[PDB]
Ligand SMILES: CC(=O)SCCNC(=O)CCNC(=O)[C@H](O)C(C)(C)COP(=O)(O)OP(=O)(O)OC[C@H]1O[C@@H](n2cnc3c(N)ncnc32)[C@H](O)[C@@H]1OP(=O)(O)O
């Protein structure tokens with residue numbers, strides 16, 4: 140699976156040399172195998188692409204005088220920023236992620252675990268939000284690591300009944316969840332991958348919320364457990380957004396219609412009854 | 414006291430070389446001095462025991478075609494994983510921990526602070542769960558780091574009132590808490606070491622739960638603060654489980670009883 | 686803006702060589718350029734100031750025999766610790782922070798973002814507490830990173846509506862929040878920078894609490910969202926504390942009056 144950095148280095152390296160700003164790691168070396176690289180000393184964006192290893196390597200770079208001429212993504216990137224935004228679609232462990240969407244390591248691990256089908260565009264997920272699935276709940280044991288003691292036949296028995304379990308432990312026998320576009324998810328939020336298949340477009344998940352069921356489009360959910368406090372817009376307004384899908388507009392189209400995006404009232408007058 | 418890695422190496426190294434997968438740190442080099450170690454390049458389990466420094470290094474190692482012949486614990490381990498599961502009973506800062514039981518740094522720190530008496534077998538604690546004790550609440554101040562300014566005279570009367578406080582600030586004057594076997598603790602959960610002395614066997618603690626009270630065996634508790642939602646099993650089943658104690662079974666009898674472990678109804682017909 | 690380390694070295698280094706304990710990073714090498722430094726081998730507090738890079742490095746250092754003659758802050762410090770306590774008033778991204786006050790990376794970021802005006806003395810903030818502001822809620826979109834696509838003119842009208850917004854998205858058009866002295870903030874707590882301007886002196890914010898409005902002095906708030914459960918003291922006691930301000934006492938005054946700090950009744954009798 141290509142990392143975020145590999146996907147960008149593909150796009151933008153264009154025959155340049157990779158300049159590693161920071162102490163390299165094993166994961167970074169494996170990612171830099173197809174490319175030629177050296178430690179960063181003097182760097183010129185015309186000959187070098189700067190890879191900061193950690194986020195603290197990046198702010199050291201950005202506080203250096205040579206960062207003056209480097210553009211984000213085009214000329215530099217952070218390796219330890221797998222959830223960082225990009226202005227184009229990318230793949231996070233083969234999970235599609237739309238433009239201008241970012242998240243933290245709890246969501247990265249969820250993509251790796253297969254819990255996520257897709258993440259949409261213009262979606263903002265706090266770095267401490269978490270997504271996990273339930274263990275089996277209708278067996279004599281609740282442990283998962285006990286399966287490290289199962290031989291092949293016991294494991295087979297065990298896997299057979301996990302797949303028939305209608306509560307979807309470890310997200311078995313359910314569709315991976317789709318996180319919509321223009322979604323907001325707050326700090327320390329939790330989403331149960333065993334019971335959630337959908338976070339609708341425009342949904343807001345407040346800080347500390349424990350999400351155990353699907354979140355309808357443009358609903359605001361808070362609490363432990365999370366419940367709908369309100370919707371961002373009227374039911375007539377939501378139907379309109381889901382039809383227009385401004386999050387699919389081009390960059391040109393976004394700027395030319397910024398008004399309708401800044402003013403929900405004007406959006407409704409223009410696109411409601413067309 | 415001995416770190417998790419040292420207990421594993423003493424048991425499984427078997428005269429091999431330690432092959433370090435990742436950038437070695439000061440703490441790792443100190444723990445590796447009694448042994449022979451080198452940076453990992455080409456490794457074979459007949460001659461090398463692979464130690465991944467960070468969990469980032471481990472996933473890179475498991476991505477290497479060389480890792481296929483390496484079995485967990487017996488042939489490789491992560492150093493930045495003091496709470497990671499082991500197939501044998503271990504110690505975590507003088508705290509007994511059962512087989513196939515894992516937890517995060519929040520719980521490792523709790524063992525180091527003396528908050529935990531023991532942790533059972535086959536217990537699953539999410540990495541973000543926290544265990545902490547309360548600051549003092551019967552004083553003019555709640556700060557703890559103000560004591561960095563206390564001389565020994567002030568330190569003495571401060572320590573004095575703490576240990577008499579019936580609300581057990583910093584878990585003073587109370588027994589450390591036992592965490593049972595087959596326990597599940599969810600993400601961002603919190604357990605108050607001032608007020609909790611037992612998490613019973615089989616208890617489930619939900620994500621985001623704030624646990625201020627002992628949790629009975631096989632109770633499911635959720636919420637802020639945590640309340641008992643339901644129990645996993647009937648009363649008679651719970652008694653049977655507390656008598657049978659399948660979590661003390663050997664590896665073979667766990668496999669022999671996989672049908673009873675999978676189906677609670679078959680468990681009762683057999684053992685009830 | 687000076688890092689925490691820079692502020693400590695300026696105050697305590699006193700012509701000694703900086704001895705680096707751990708793998709040095711790019712950020713650290715830059716911070717150490719105005720000073721003479723080398724990798725730590727053998728160290729003597731008479732001639733060396735030890736800088737541990739990570740908290741892991743510091744654990745190794747304090748377990749080494751060479752450390753037992755070293756005093757915290759005066760002779761050693763961790764570089765990976767901008768939220769760590771200091772015995773003197775410091776700045777964190779030009780936010781004033783009182784003595785013996787500590788917090789985690791979530792609060793360091795809030796200082797960097799401009800969400801915090803000041804943090805008082807002897808205040809204890811758990812490492813998993815978080816402080817953030819709201820996105821705009823009066824527009825068709827909630828995203829913030831859409832503005833990366835806004836051309837020059839679209840950016841202008843976007844920022845103009847942000848500034849006139851009474852719910853203060855991104856903490857616009859509001860005062861940064863003041864966190865008081867003798868404050869306690871628990872694990873996984875959250876404070877909303879868009880609606881909160883004051884955490885009063887002596888306030889207690891429980892574990893898991895979601896704080897959406899101002900916390901009065903010496904109030905105890907818990908829950909999701911946080912609600913006032915009780916106050917630490919009587920109203921007249923609270924007014925006396927806010928007038929006396931023991932948290933600004935000198936070190937000598939704290940030790941001389943330790944019995945009043947340990948006994949609330951003695952405090953009220955002496956200062957009420
Ligand atoms: C992408 C990133 O990195 S995000 C960075 C970190 N930022 C955050 O976590 C911000 C989280 N924001 C929130 O939680 C906000 O409250 C949001 C998104 C729900 C917006 O709140 P707004 O509605 O202003 O809140 P306002 O108080 O009107 O809300 C009204 C009701 O919702 C409740 N509410 C709001 N948030 C929560 C919450 N997180 N938990 C419980 N209740 C909440 C309020 O208490 C209030 O209840 P009351 O009138 O019902 O008694």
Ligand SMILES: CC(=O)SCCNC(=O)CCNC(=O)[C@H](O)C(C)(C)COP(=O)(O)OP(=O)(O)OC[C@H]1O[C@@H](n2cnc3c(N)ncnc32)[C@H](O)[C@@H]1OP(=O)(O)O
Pocket residue numbers: 271272273276331349351363364537538539540597598599600617618619620621622633635636642
């Ligand atoms: C060690 C690790 O691997 S941790 C990995 C990280 N994973 C997690 O943290 C997931 C944690 N999981 C949980 O918290 C689960 O939801 C568990 C185990 C309690 C689930 O219990 P279940 O039996 O599925 O409950 P089921 O969904 O029917 O719902 C029961 C009730 O509990 C509520 N509930 C479930 N979990 C929570 C929770 N975490 N907080 C509040 N309420 C909860 C449900 O809303 C429902 O309420 P109701 O019955 O009042 O309507």
Ligand SMILES: CC(=O)SCCNC(=O)CCNC(=O)[C@H](O)C(C)(C)COP(=O)(O)OP(=O)(O)OC[C@H]1O[C@@H](n2cnc3c(N)ncnc32)[C@H](O)[C@@H]1OP(=O)(O)O
Pocket residue numbers: 544545546547550605623625637638809810811812869870871872889890891892893894905907908914
């Ligand atoms: C760096 C650090 O700060 S270390 C962090 C690790 N430790 C923590 O975060 C522990 C934080 N401490 C707490 O949460 C404590 O409960 C405190 C200090 C906030 C208050 O505890 P106390 O004053 O002893 O309250 P005591 O348990 O009687 O409970 C009083 C009421 O508050 C409620 N309560 C206590 N804690 C919480 C909580 N965390 N969340 C919601 N309610 C709570 C109790 O349920 C009780 O309710 P009741 O009146 O209905 O019975």
